[PDB]
Design an enzyme around this catalytic site. Structure first.
Site, PDB file in Angstrom:
ATOM      1  N   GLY A 138       0.932  -1.149  -0.006  1.00 36.20           N
ATOM      2  CA  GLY A 138      -0.145  -0.022  -0.051  1.00 36.20           C
ATOM      3  C   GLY A 138       0.775   1.267   0.172  1.00 36.20           C
ATOM      4  O   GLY A 138       2.090   1.097  -0.098  1.00 36.20           O
ATOM      5  N   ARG A 139       0.121   2.402   0.189  1.00 33.22           N
ATOM      6  CA  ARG A 139       0.904   3.732   0.238  1.00 33.22           C
ATOM      7  C   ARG A 139       1.868   3.833   1.230  1.00 33.22           C
ATOM      8  O   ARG A 139       3.051   3.697   1.055  1.00 33.22           O
ATOM      9  CB  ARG A 139      -0.138   4.949   0.193  1.00 33.22           C
ATOM     10  CG  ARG A 139      -0.975   4.728  -1.002  1.00 33.22           C
ATOM     11  CD  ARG A 139      -0.534   4.523  -2.262  1.00 33.22           C
ATOM     12  NE  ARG A 139      -1.275   4.759  -3.324  1.00 33.22           N
ATOM     13  CZ  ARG A 139      -0.688   4.758  -4.851  1.00 33.22           C
ATOM     14  NH1 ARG A 139       0.562   4.140  -4.926  1.00 33.22           N
ATOM     15  NH2 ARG A 139      -1.743   4.682  -5.787  1.00 33.22           N
ATOM     16  N   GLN A 140       1.428   4.019   2.447  1.00 33.60           N
ATOM     17  CA  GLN A 140       2.324   4.187   3.595  1.00 33.60           C
ATOM     18  C   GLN A 140       2.811   2.700   3.981  1.00 33.60           C
ATOM     19  O   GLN A 140       3.201   2.494   5.011  1.00 33.60           O
ATOM     20  CB  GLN A 140       1.475   4.818   4.773  1.00 33.60           C
ATOM     21  CG  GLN A 140       1.318   6.268   4.759  1.00 33.60           C
ATOM     22  CD  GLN A 140       2.613   6.868   4.503  1.00 33.60           C
ATOM     23  OE1 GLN A 140       3.208   6.945   3.503  1.00 33.60           O
ATOM     24  NE2 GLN A 140       3.066   7.481   5.490  1.00 33.60           N
ATOM     25  N   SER A 141       3.054   1.724   2.951  1.00 33.22           N
ATOM     26  CA  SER A 141       3.368   0.655   3.065  1.00 33.22           C
ATOM     27  C   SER A 141       4.644   0.518   4.123  1.00 33.22           C
ATOM     28  O   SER A 141       5.736   1.518   3.698  1.00 33.22           O
ATOM     29  CB  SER A 141       3.872  -0.054   1.737  1.00 33.22           C
ATOM     30  OG  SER A 141       4.585  -1.558   2.004  1.00 33.22           O
ATOM     31  N   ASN A 142       4.680   0.098   5.112  1.00 39.18           N
ATOM     32  CA  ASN A 142       5.987  -0.217   6.179  1.00 39.18           C
ATOM     33  C   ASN A 142       6.973  -1.043   5.275  1.00 39.18           C
ATOM     34  O   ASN A 142       8.336  -0.590   5.383  1.00 39.18           O
ATOM     35  CB  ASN A 142       5.419  -0.596   7.347  1.00 39.18           C
ATOM     36  CG  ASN A 142       4.459   0.201   8.180  1.00 39.18           C
ATOM     37  OD1 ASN A 142       4.838   1.463   8.512  1.00 39.18           O
ATOM     38  ND2 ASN A 142       3.255  -0.137   8.374  1.00 39.18           N
TER      39      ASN A 142
END
Ligand SMILES: Cc1ncc(COP(=O)(O)O)c(C=O)c1O
Ligand SMILES: Cc1ncc(COP(=O)(O)O)c(C=O)c1O
Lengths: 341, 341
Positions: free
Chosen positions: A75-79
């Site tokens: 995802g976007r803020q994929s850690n």
């Protein structure tokens, strides 16, 4: 048993510390003694996080082989990607990250949410970040393979690293060792853990924590806390990953199901809830530990909701698993107005 | 052993680990061997940091007598405050923070600079944020002493946590301990460090390092890379924090000067430059280690410049002190655009 039969490329300072969220306990009646094994304090590799523990058993393959690029996804803020990048920069290799839309980008965040926090850190490390507005799915995607196919055409040799590595042969080995540290750590402190809680959305983390724990017949100590609001394909996959690992680390004890408290997932994946935040604050206001509106936070409430309903015995020592993810916190600035007077 | 006479309140995981930045060294042309003592990985307290270690020698008084609130002061992205918060949380007290205007907020980041990273965090930890419009200065402020009385009017007994704790009677002790670790670590590493590079602004960090390194007559090994863009006060204060402390610990030697390379502070505290942004990138791309546009990116580029100009003995061991700061990075996303491959 045998995680030792697998090559491990260190990426962490060693055994992850376990924090004693004691002062946070007394705010919860002092019913259950809360403890948090800080994975969010892994290494110096861009904040750290669970993905590193998983990677340590994957790097060998990469390095031993003559590869060129490390491509992941999320995802976007994929850690994760942000840690696949840091890994790439350390192995001194190219990195291609595929970030898709897996959360309804809260309007009061629609701008910063895609260029601040984690994704940014992935760019700063010179990765080949790539945005794509594709739906959420904790399974293989049809953009990852394509990207892979892309480099294989430019005359390169890319290494696949599926979302959470959950679908990577050695994605579980990482936390199998997670267990081992726990057992060893109980003896050093002189504290056994009646139950261990940790987030989950793709599997691997908890799955390995299972088979790892399974080594000691303690799978039961585990207490997953769905955070993907798709308990179906989640308990399924997290449970499937769990058995595979067993085969590898040489564990017979088969897996059929696991404590997957699924009452804190809502709304969807990424969007928290009025409670999520209240916990995030309490843990923060009390301990000093930061959580996030996508993972650790949601399980931090589940951790507290239960402590309320005396799900545990008095004097019970529960081990919370902080998998980090706080760097994303900056992409959810709105959800936290300043303290009311 | 003068730093032992002073009680220490366990605020950090243990002695800060040292990363061997070998890949970056090879990159900067096998000139030296760069090491980084990771203070940006010293706690579970909101990404940890440098201030914490300083606090470990001050928190003892917060508990002894009776103090209601913990009040500090810094810029819209100060870490000093984003850590004093957590400390206030753990120490179970109230958090009043004054965020003076210390940085000319870039036109791009002005719609974010005040609600992400350091700030957002500080808030979540249920802190009483106060975005004041005063300007930069490493000396005792007005808005500060104001609130001290302000609160003491509403009837309380707050605790004075100034800028970087530098002004604080104990501000130096923290890093005098740092040195202690360096020597012990050199032992366990089987190597000796030749120089120590470290960003400087309010001066308590370097002062502590100086005071402590002096314990072994190595005070010269210190190499401060300013980031305030104002030698005088910064040097004339660090040089002060350095002596006062040198006496608390018993070290006779007096500091009348110290290496403060003021070549990269340009153009002003808070804002970076192609050189800064360039270092961060280099380091991040080489080690996955993140540095900030305010304190560690500048001390890093300095560390880089010095290596070009062959400032260090061939095959020297340079210890790059990483005091954290990466959390604020989310408020400088503009300066870091996606890279081409
Ligand atoms: C902070 C954090 N917590 C938990 C998880 C869960 O991982 P998994 O789905 O592999 O269990 C992730 C990914 C994460 O980034
Ligand atoms: C991240 C960071 N680095 C460096 C400093 C500088 O500390 P000092 O003024 O004590 O050298 C501060 C304050 C800080 O927050």
């Amino acid at each position: 048993a045998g995680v030792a039969k697998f090559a491990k490329y260190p990426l962490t300072f060693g055994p992850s510390p376990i924090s004693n969220l004691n002062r946070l306990s007394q705010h919860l009646g002092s019913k259950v003694n809360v403890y948090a094994k800080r994975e969010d304090c892994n290494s110096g590799l861009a904040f750290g996080g669970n993905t590193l523990r998983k990677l340590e058993y994957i790097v060998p393959d990469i390095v031993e082989g003559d590869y060129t690029h490390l491509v992941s996804i999320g995802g976007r803020q994929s850690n994760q990607t942000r840690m696949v990048a840091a890994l790439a920069a350390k192995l001194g290799k190219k990195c291609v990250l595929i970030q898709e839309d897996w959360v309804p980008i809260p309007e009061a965040e629609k701008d910063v949410y895609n260029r601040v926090g984690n994704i940014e850190l992935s760019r700063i490390m010179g990765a080949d970040v790539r945005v794509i507005e594709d739906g959420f799915d904790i399974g293989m995607r049809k953009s990852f393979a394509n990207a892979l196919q892309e480099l294989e055409d430019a005359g390169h040799k890319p290494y696949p690293i599926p979302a959470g590595c959950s679908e990577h042969k050695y994605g579980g080995l990482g936390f199998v060792g997670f267990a081992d540290e726990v057992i060893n750590q109980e003896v050093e402190l002189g504290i056994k853990f009646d139950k261990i809680v940790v987030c989950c959305v793709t599997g691997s983390t908890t799955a390995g924590i299972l088979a790892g724990m399974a080594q000691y017949g303690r799978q039961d100590d585990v207490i997953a806390i769905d955070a993907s609001f798709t308990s179906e394909k989640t308990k399924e996959q997290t449970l499937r990953i769990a058995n595979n690992t067993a085969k590898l680390i040489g564990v017979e004890h088969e897996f059929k199901d696991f404590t997957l408290d699924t009452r804190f997932a809502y709304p969807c994946y990424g969007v928290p809830n009025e409670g999520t935040i209240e916990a995030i604050r309490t843990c923060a206001e009390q301990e000093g530990v930061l959580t996030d509106p996508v993972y650790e936070g949601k399980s931090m409430q589940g951790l507290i909701a239960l402590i309320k309903e005396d799900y545990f015995k008095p004097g019970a020592n529960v081990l919370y698993v902080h998998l980090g993810g706080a760097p994303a916190l900056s992409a959810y600035s709105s959800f936290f107005p300043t303290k009311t007077a």
